[PDB]
Enzyme design. Sequence first.
Site, short mmCIF file in Angstrom:
data_model
loop_
_atom_site.label_atom_id
_atom_site.label_comp_id
_atom_site.label_asym_id
_atom_site.label_seq_id
_atom_site.Cartn_x
_atom_site.Cartn_y
_atom_site.Cartn_z
N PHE A 1 59.83 -58.98 -61.72
CA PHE A 1 58.69 -58.04 -61.61
C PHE A 1 58.96 -56.68 -62.32
O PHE A 1 58.08 -56.15 -63.05
CB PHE A 1 58.29 -57.85 -60.13
N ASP B 1 60.79 -56.67 -43.21
CA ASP B 1 61.76 -57.37 -44.01
C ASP B 1 63.13 -56.66 -44.07
O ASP B 1 63.81 -56.73 -45.08
CB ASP B 1 61.23 -57.66 -45.43
CG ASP B 1 62.16 -58.59 -46.21
OD1 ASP B 1 62.72 -59.52 -45.54
OD2 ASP B 1 62.39 -58.35 -47.43
N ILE C 1 69.59 -49.83 -64.31
CA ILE C 1 70.39 -50.04 -63.11
C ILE C 1 69.97 -51.28 -62.32
O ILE C 1 70.63 -51.67 -61.39
CB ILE C 1 70.43 -48.80 -62.16
CG1 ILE C 1 69.06 -48.20 -61.92
CG2 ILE C 1 71.34 -47.73 -62.72
CD1 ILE C 1 69.10 -47.17 -60.81
N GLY C 2 68.87 -51.91 -62.68
CA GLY C 2 68.43 -53.14 -62.01
C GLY C 2 67.38 -53.83 -62.86
O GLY C 2 66.59 -53.16 -63.51
N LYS C 3 67.39 -55.17 -62.88
CA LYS C 3 66.41 -55.91 -63.68
C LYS C 3 66.05 -57.19 -62.95
O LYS C 3 66.89 -58.04 -62.75
CB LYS C 3 66.93 -56.21 -65.10
CG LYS C 3 65.82 -56.54 -66.14
CD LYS C 3 66.41 -56.92 -67.53
CE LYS C 3 66.62 -58.45 -67.68
NZ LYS C 3 67.40 -58.85 -68.89
N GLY C 4 64.81 -57.30 -62.50
CA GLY C 4 64.32 -58.51 -61.86
C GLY C 4 63.30 -59.16 -62.77
O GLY C 4 63.32 -58.94 -63.99
N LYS D 1 61.29 -47.15 -61.32
CA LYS D 1 60.94 -48.55 -61.27
C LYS D 1 59.76 -48.77 -62.23
O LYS D 1 58.70 -48.18 -62.06
CB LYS D 1 60.59 -48.96 -59.83
CG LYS D 1 60.68 -50.49 -59.56
CD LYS D 1 60.13 -50.93 -58.14
CE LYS D 1 61.22 -51.08 -56.99
NZ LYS D 1 60.58 -51.25 -55.54
#
Length: 300
Positions: free
Chosen positions: A17, A128, A12-15, A35
């Site tokens: 890190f 942040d 569902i997400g890929k960065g 994660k």
Amino acid sequence: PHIGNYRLLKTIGKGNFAKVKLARHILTGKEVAVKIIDKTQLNSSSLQKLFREVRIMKVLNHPNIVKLFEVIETEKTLYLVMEYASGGEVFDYLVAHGRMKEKEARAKFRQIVSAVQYCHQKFIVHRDLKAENLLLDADMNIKIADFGSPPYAAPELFQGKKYDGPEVDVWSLGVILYTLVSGSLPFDGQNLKELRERVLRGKYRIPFYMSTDCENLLKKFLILNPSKRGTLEQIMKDRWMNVGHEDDELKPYVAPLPDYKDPRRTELMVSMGYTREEIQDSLVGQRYNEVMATYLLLGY
């Protein structure tokens, strides 16, 4: 693929890190987000930040903050098993739908201020806060995740002043209210110099449809002098915050007492081969190990 007790279901997400996977907890059938972080690729301050975030996520237990279920640590890889927020970002939801009407903005913003004020009660400053941090669950309740940034920066950033206290979060919350009710940013620019001049003047356009109540609330966040911004506990008493809530004024969140000995979940767990003692030890110790994870996840 399997790690611990999790069947990984889809990315569902890929960065750079981390990858985030949607997974199912095998023992409970529960859907979680995992994660997966390759620590071997992280530099020193990224490791600093990861260890701080793990420490913060372990401590926060608020209905509008992404819950942690498990931390699995190897030498090379860290996995953070957490609550899946399946409703997307408030950011995407604004672009897609338009501004929120004030009544809807208020429902979300009560949850946002409650979550952030609860962090402050515990001396955690987010520092942040922005649109990407504000997720939605399946019922469009706010879930703050993760512990487009320049539009949210408090003026002290561009003054070269200290950028440290809860008052930085108080300024960013004013920016979030503004974006919720208008669908645009109060301080924008074609570049950073432009952005800085606006943030430092502190003046924003009042959209024609905004209520005076709502404009009076923004003025309590968007105060240029840091030491003059009110606490979130004081701002919870604002009139706009409480329109439609005469019976329940927004107040600092009080978390329920620990229930670590629930006989229903404990029986299920002894069956799985866990001992009553390790269930107790793990929970009291807030260990976030498999035993603690399984107990928390049985609580759905």
